[PDB]
Write a protein that binds this DNA or RNA. Structure first.
Ligand SMILES: [Zn+2]
Lengths: 213, 136, 25, 101, 67
RNA sequence: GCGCAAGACGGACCAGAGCGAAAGCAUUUGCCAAGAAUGUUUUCAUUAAUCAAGAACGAAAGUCGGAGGUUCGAAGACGAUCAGAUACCGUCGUAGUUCCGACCAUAAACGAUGCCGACCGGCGAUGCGGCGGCGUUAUUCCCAUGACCCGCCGGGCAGCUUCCGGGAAACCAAAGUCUUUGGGUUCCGGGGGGAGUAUGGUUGCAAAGCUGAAACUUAAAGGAAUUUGGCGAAGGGCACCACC
RNA sequence: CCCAUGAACGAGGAAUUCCCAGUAAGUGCGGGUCAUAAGCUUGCGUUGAUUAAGUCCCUGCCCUUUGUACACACCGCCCGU
RNA sequence: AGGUCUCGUA
């Protein structure tokens, strides 16, 4: 009888200046009818956009979560909320005749942004190796897990989120873990397969407007 | 009624979840946030036959209808997310996913990123049925 | 007639005999 | 009489293995006896591949691959024609089937 | 679709075994005379020799098996 | 799509790989106690192997008393298949599935093979510890250690071949060293039913557990392997009395 | 043999038969059945081309492997009220 | 200086 789309708006979401591409997409929201504010339906929004559509030229199988914190007008502002990996990549990384090492660390940054970083690692076969299994001892696995835990907890408490997100754009933490684990057992790839945001501090406006240039 | 920006500047992006089981096909188009949608068209509305709910024809017709509505609104490009039944029963998408995707991409739409969002569990409860399984 | 159901029926018969003896003797 | 040197499984010094569930059926079977099938498959086979390829937002893109593992009970594995009966001396051959396609 | 393609003529340089329920379809590896680079597997009805020229309406459809 | 609450559970990594007397055992970390093997020019010096009485543990189902009850699901309610289904199937669904106690002590608890000790062929792999040796890697040098490779030694789950040998055969480095019959020591079998029944004892709230016949009846019941028989088994070949 | 009366039949449902080189088919002529005797059968002539050089999908048959409590052999054997 | 670089085919 009546199309609700006539009573609809359109807003463009923005990305923090710490990334290259500023626009992401356009979201349709019902017009402000009655006492229900339109901006109230703009806060809890999560975008599962890949980093390829958010950076000039980088890895395309990594994804990030962006949460909106404030909208000025006809233009919504976002913030970092998490990061995940492609499910196909994770499925293809877990293969046979190799040991997977997992480790979750609950470490807070300088400010009250508590994150639970996860890690995944595998062992492989040397170019002259004949043993098809190429497993690892339990103590070696424990030592590797401790090394990964220490490496991640060292590069979080010393700095704020604003530039450790930039640090997360490449696998700098992964490369550091890979280089630090050459002595126990040679791993090939270290990935932070999931990052959750457990706690956030009191909402602030100055930090938000500084984030968007 | 139409797109908020010019039809020549860039492509307006929206995400579409295709849920396919061995007895139905679900096509759903929403905004990038996933909160507000556009329309929901499934093979259970097109063909009035339950035994033929999961078929390439029903999926094709539902995809054509949803693509026509999407073109009417003004959304140009779609990010497609496949999903099977998940839970604990099966992980293979139903027969309607292939035909639905081919139909909605042949309608004239543009397709971006593909991602599987099936709810595969690390460890679920006991599967339905007895110890000896479902024998027919 | 397999052994399992035969044993179950014999157990039922023994239970009946025991019950009748206990309510009668 | 005994048909196989083993007991139709790989349990030699354990005495118990984790029970899993079949995929085609719902039967609960031991892990080492249940036939496990690993399949590598793409999203589209030969029909929508062109439609995705030429009609796409991005160029120079590799199609994603769906990954899943299958567990088949013996009755379900044979009824779906995954394995078939062999000769008495042909059952002793443990070589995997040839793969060239 | 909004896709218009020219009518391409290809050369059958090899005939393979006949496919189908009753063997009514043969499989050949066509060869574009203008582009001596691609060898596409295409199914064609009727009797065909090795050396005839076909009329491929589309040059991308690689013929599959029965279904 | 975003948050909340509850219970169960530990996928892919997961293997003819590991540990435990058996049943059995998988998310990270912290604490407590124990054990096999390897190494030993340490210590005691026959302290040894198997076992009537007795004793601990013992899958799921089974009962009693508390807490929780997410999911699956005996009994039950309903609908279709069916000639007939209170069966196969589908939706709900109590007791149970979970934990803390108190009980039973049962399986195809199977390697259907008791334990200790000696000997008699070979060949590669895998997990542990020790030992010798080129060479790469933790970037380029020096050493110790991990990772890789080439061997050796001891114990352990297993693999392949054979006129050692054996068996009725299936097959077995043990199921061998057995009429050319004796290494040590426990339990147990005497044609097939009746029958693991009745009875007596005994343990248990109960369910049931251990010990356990006789009267009558039959000349068969059974183990291995070939040729045809049939499959609502698989895989091949042919036919214009099959097809395109 | 001659005259006259002129219905259905306007190319055929489900289903189904035969066949590929001088071929089906169109066409006519002999022998057998015969005192009267070809809508049958068996041969004989004449005109005459396409549909393919394959397959196991259907309808059937035949071998290999596999399982057996069946040997009069599935029309078998066999359990219970 | 020239303009589809050579051999086989799930
Ligand atoms: Zn099954």
């Amino acid at each position: 009888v009546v199309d609700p789309f006539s009573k609809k708006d359109w807003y463009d979401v923005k990305a923090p200046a710490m990334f290259n591409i500023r626009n992401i997409g356009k979201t349709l929201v019902t017009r402000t009818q009655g006492t229900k504010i339109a901006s109230d339906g703009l806060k809890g929004r999560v975008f599962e956009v890949s980093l390829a559509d958010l950076q000039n030229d980088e890895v395309a199988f990594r994804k990030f979560k962006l949460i909106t914190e404030d909208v000025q007008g006809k233009n919504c502002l976002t913030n970092f909320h998490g990061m995940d990996l492609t499910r196909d990549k994770m499925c293809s990384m877990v293969k046979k005749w190799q040991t997977m090492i997992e480790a979750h660390v609950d470490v807070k940054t300088t400010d009250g942004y508590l994150l639970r970083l996860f890690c995944v690692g595998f062992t492989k076969k040397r170019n002259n190796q004949i043993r098809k299994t190429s497993y690892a001892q339990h103590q070696q696995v424990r030592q590797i897990r401790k090394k990964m835990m220490e490496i991640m907890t060292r590069e979080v408490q010393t700095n704020d989120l604003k530039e450790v997100v930039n640090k997360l754009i490449p696998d700098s933490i992964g490369k550091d873990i890979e280089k630090a684990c050459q002595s126990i057992y040679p791993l090939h790839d270290v990935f932070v397969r999931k990052v959750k945001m457990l706690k956030k501090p009191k909402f602030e406006l100055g930090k938000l407007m500084e984030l968007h240039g | 009624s139409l797109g908020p920006q010019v039809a020549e500047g860039e492509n307006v992006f929206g995400v579409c979840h295709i849920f396919a089981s061995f007895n139905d096909t679900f096509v759903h188009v929403t905004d990038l946030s996933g909160k507000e949608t556009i329309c929901r068209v499934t093979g259970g509305m097109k063909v009035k036959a339950d035994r033929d709910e999961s078929s390439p024809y029903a999926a094709m017709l539902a995809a054509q209808d949803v693509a026509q509505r999407c073109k009417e609104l003004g959304i140009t490009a779609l990010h497609i997310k496949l999903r099977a039944t998940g839970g604990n029963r099966t992980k293979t998408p139903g027969p309607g996913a292939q035909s639905a995707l081919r139909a909605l991409a042949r309608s004239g739409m543009k397709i971006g990123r593909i991602e599987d969002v099936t709810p595969i569990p690390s460890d679920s409860t006991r599967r339905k049925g007895g110890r000896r399984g479902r024998r027919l | 007639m397999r052994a399992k159901w035969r044993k179950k029926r014999m157990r039922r018969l023994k239970r009946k005999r025991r019950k009748m003896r206990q309510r009668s003797k | 009489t005994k048909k196989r040197r083993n007991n139709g499984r790989a349990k030699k010094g354990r005495g118990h293995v984790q029970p899993i569930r079949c995929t085609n059926c719902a039967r609960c079977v031991p892990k080492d006896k249940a036939i496990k099938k690993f399949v590598i498959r793409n999203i589209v086979e030969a029909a929508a591949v062109r439609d995705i390829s030429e009609a796409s937002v991005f160029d120079a893109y590799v199609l994603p691959k769906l990954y899943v593992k299958l567990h088949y009970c013996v009755s379900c594995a044979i009824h779906s024609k995954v394995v078939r009966n062999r000769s008495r001396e042909a059952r002793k051959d443990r070589t995997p089937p040839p793969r060239f396609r | 679709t909004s896709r218009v393609q020219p009518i391409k003529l290809a050369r059958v340089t090899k005939v393979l075994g006949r496919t189908g329920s009753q063997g009514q379809c043969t499989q050949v590896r066509v060869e574009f005379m203008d582009d001596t680079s691609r060898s596409i597997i295409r199914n064609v009805k009727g009797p065909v020799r090795e050396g005839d020229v076909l009329t491929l309406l589309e040059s991308e459809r690689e013929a599959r098996r029965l279904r």
